[PDB]
Amino acid sequence: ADTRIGVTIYKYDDNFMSVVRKAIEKDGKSAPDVQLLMNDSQNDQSKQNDQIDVLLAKGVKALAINLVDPAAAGTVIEKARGQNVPVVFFNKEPSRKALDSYDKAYYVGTDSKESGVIQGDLIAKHWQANQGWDLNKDGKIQYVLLKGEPGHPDAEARTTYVVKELNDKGIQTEQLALDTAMWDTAQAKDKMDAWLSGPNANKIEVVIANNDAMAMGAVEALKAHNKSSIPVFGVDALPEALALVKSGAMAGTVLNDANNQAKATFDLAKNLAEGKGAADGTSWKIENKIVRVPYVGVDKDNLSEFTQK
Numbered sequence: 131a132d133t134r135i136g137v138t139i140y141k142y143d144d145n146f147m148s149v150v151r152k153a154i155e156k157d158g159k160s161a162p163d164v165q166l167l168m169n170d171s172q173n174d175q176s177k178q179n180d181q182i183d184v185l186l187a188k189g190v191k192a193l194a195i196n197l198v199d200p201a202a203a204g205t206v207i208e209k210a211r212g213q214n215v216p217v218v219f220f221n222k223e224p225s226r227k228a229l230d231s232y233d234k235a236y237y238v239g240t241d242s243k244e245s246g247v248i249q250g251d252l253i254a255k256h257w258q259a260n261q262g263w264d265l266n267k268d269g270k271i272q273y274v275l276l277k278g279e280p281g282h283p284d285a286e287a288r289t290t291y292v293v294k295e296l297n298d299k300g301i302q303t304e305q306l307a308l309d310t311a312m313w314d315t316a317q318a319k320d321k322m323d324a325w326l327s328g329p330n331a332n333k334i335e336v337v338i339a340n341n342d343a344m345a346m347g348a349v350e351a352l353k354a355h356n357k358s359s360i361p362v363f364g365v366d367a368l369p370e371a372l373a374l375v376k377s378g379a380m381a382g383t384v385l386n387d388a389n390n391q392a393k394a395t396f397d398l399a400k401n402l403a404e405g406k407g408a409a410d411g412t413s414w415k416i417e418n419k420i421v422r423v424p425y426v427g428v429d430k431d432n433l434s435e436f437t438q439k
C-alpha cells in the first residue's frame with residue numbers, strides 16, 4: 131500500500147523534461163497505492179548520485195532515473211544492484227553494455243534517428259512548397275544548425291539525420307554554421323544573435339534546431355533583427371512551440387511524446403516495484419529491455435490533432 135518509487139529528473143527547468151515530470155506526477159496522483167519521491171538533480175551527476183543513495187535509504191522499491199550524464203549508468207546500476215532494486219532509465223539512453231549488465235535495468239525513450247528523419251522530411255516538404263525560401267536561388271538550402279548537448283543520443287542523431295534525409299530527398303545543403311546551445315532557449319538566442327551580426331547573416335535561409343526550446347531562442351533573435359520571414363524548425367512539440375507553428379513564427383516541429391514516455395516509465399517502474407514482469411498488464415512493447423515511443427511530424431496541416439487551431 132506504501133509502494134515507494136524514487137524519480138530523478140536531470141534538470142527540472144529543461145522545457146521538455148518539465149512536461150514529462152508533470153505527467154509522471156499526474157500518473158502517480160492517480161494510482162492510490164503509489165508514492166513518488168521526485169528529485170531535481172540540477173544538471174549535476176554527483177548531485178544525482180547522492181540523491182539515489184538517499185532514495186535507497188528511504189526504501190524505494192524501484193528507481194526511475196533520467197541521467198545527467200549517460201555514461202553514469204554503471205554507477206547507478208551498481209547502487210541499485212546491491213539492494214536488488216529495479217532501475218528504469220528514461221530519456222537519456224545509456225550504453226547497451228551498461229543495460230545488459232543488470233537484469234533489472236530497463237530503458238524508456240525513443241528511436242533518436244527517427245526524429246531527425248521526420249524533421250528532414252518536414253523541411254523537404256516545406257522547401258518544395260516555398261520556392262521563395264531559396265534566397266540566393268541556387269537550388270541548395272543554406273542553413274544554420276543549433277545542436278543539443280554533445281554526445282546526447284538525440285542531439286547526435288537529430289544533427290546527422292536531418293541533413294542525411296534532405297540529401298536523400300534530393301535537396302543539397304550547405305551548412306553556414308553549427309554550434310551547441312545545450313537544449314537552452316537563452317543560449318540559442320545568443321548564438322543566433324551572433325550569426326545575425328556576422329558576415330553570413332544575409333545568406334541564412336533555414337534555421338534547424340535539435341529542439342523547440344532552442345528554436346524559440348532563435349525566433350527571438352530573428353524578431354530582434356526583423357528577420358522573422360526565415361523559417362525555423364524544432365523538435366518536441368511543446369505547447370509554446372505549437373503556438374509558434376500556428377502563428378507561422380515556426381515552420382514545423384516533431385512531437386516527442388512526453389505523455390506516453392511518462393506513462394510507460396510509470397507502468398514499468400510500478401510493475402517492477404511489485405515484483406511483476408515489466409510489461410505485465412500493459413500494451414508496451416519491450417524489446418531487449420527498451421520501450422521506444424514514436425515521434426510524430428507536426429506542421430500547419432495536421433496541427434489540429436495536437437492543439438486547437
Ligand SMILES: OC[C@H]1O[C@@H](O)[C@H](O)[C@@H](O)[C@H]1O
Pocket residue numbers: 144145146147221222284313340341342343365366386
Ligand atoms: O535529455 C533532455 C532532452 O531530451 C530530448 O529528447 C528533448 O528533445 C530535449 O528537448 C531535452 O529535453
Ligand SMILES: [Ca+2]
Pocket residue numbers: 264265266267268269270271272335
Ligand atoms: Ca539557397
